[PDB]
């Protein structure tokens, strides 16, 4: 089993922030499975690399056959099928939670006219979130982790992160369901062993957010 994930921004040798990489190593870790994690740079991609995704993006992933396979959605069905036990399944029902949180977080972090719909549009999505996980918490699904958490869980990070560090924004305390979420999730082995460094994360945005 083998993953190719984005490499930090300036630490070429170190773990990087894509949330979509992250999604499928916390999906490696809590299955606990086996795997060779491959750091790729993608300011100087590789040739072993471009052989492998022509289009240059990550996450790749191998199950065992060097057929590598792209789309972080398509990588943890993959994972789900070869690897059942133990169960991640998210009930179909519940796949879309979530979903229009992180492209309100970036548009929101990008904007630089505070008179916009920006930081509203996110607040609707995240009281839409907090209504989900007070009617169906602690998680998405039920008691336990599942894929669905393994794919919001990294997106609330980067909004965490970046929204503190470049607007001094925080999620408000009213959307409880929602901090006792990211504080279950945020604290899990699996998390805290695939999340960037606060460093890394800020180092992957501030260009984007200064463009």
Request: net charge negative; with cysteine.
């Amino acid at each position: 089993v083998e993953v190719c994930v984005k490499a930090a921004v300036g630490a070429p040798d170190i773990l990087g922030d894509c949330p979509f990489s992250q999604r499928v190593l916390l999906t490696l870790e809590e299955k606990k499975i086996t795997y060779e994690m491959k750091l790729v740079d993608l300011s100087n991609k590789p040739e072993w690399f471009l052989k492998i995704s022509p289009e240059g993006k990550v996450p790749v992933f191998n199950s065992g056959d060097g057929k590598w396979i792209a789309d972080s959605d398509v990588i943890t069905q993959v994972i789900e099928e070869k690897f059942p036990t133990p169960s991640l399944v998210t009930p179909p029902e519940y796949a879309s939670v979530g979903s229009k949180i992180f492209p309100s977080f970036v548009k929101f972090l990008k904007s630089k006219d505070a008179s916009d719909g920006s930081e509203k549009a996110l607040l609707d999505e995240l009281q839409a979130l907090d209504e989900h996980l007070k009617a169906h918490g602690p998680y998405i699904s039920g008691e336990n982790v599942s894929a669905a958490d393994l794919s919001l869980g990294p997106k609330l990070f980067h909004l965490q992160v970046a929204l503190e560090h470049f607007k001094g924004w925080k999620i408000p305390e009213n959307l409880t369901s929602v901090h006792a979420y990211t504080k279950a999730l945020f604290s899990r082995e699996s998390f805290v062993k695939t999340k960037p460094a606060n460093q890394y994360l800020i180092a992957g945005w501030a260009p984007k957010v200064n463009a």
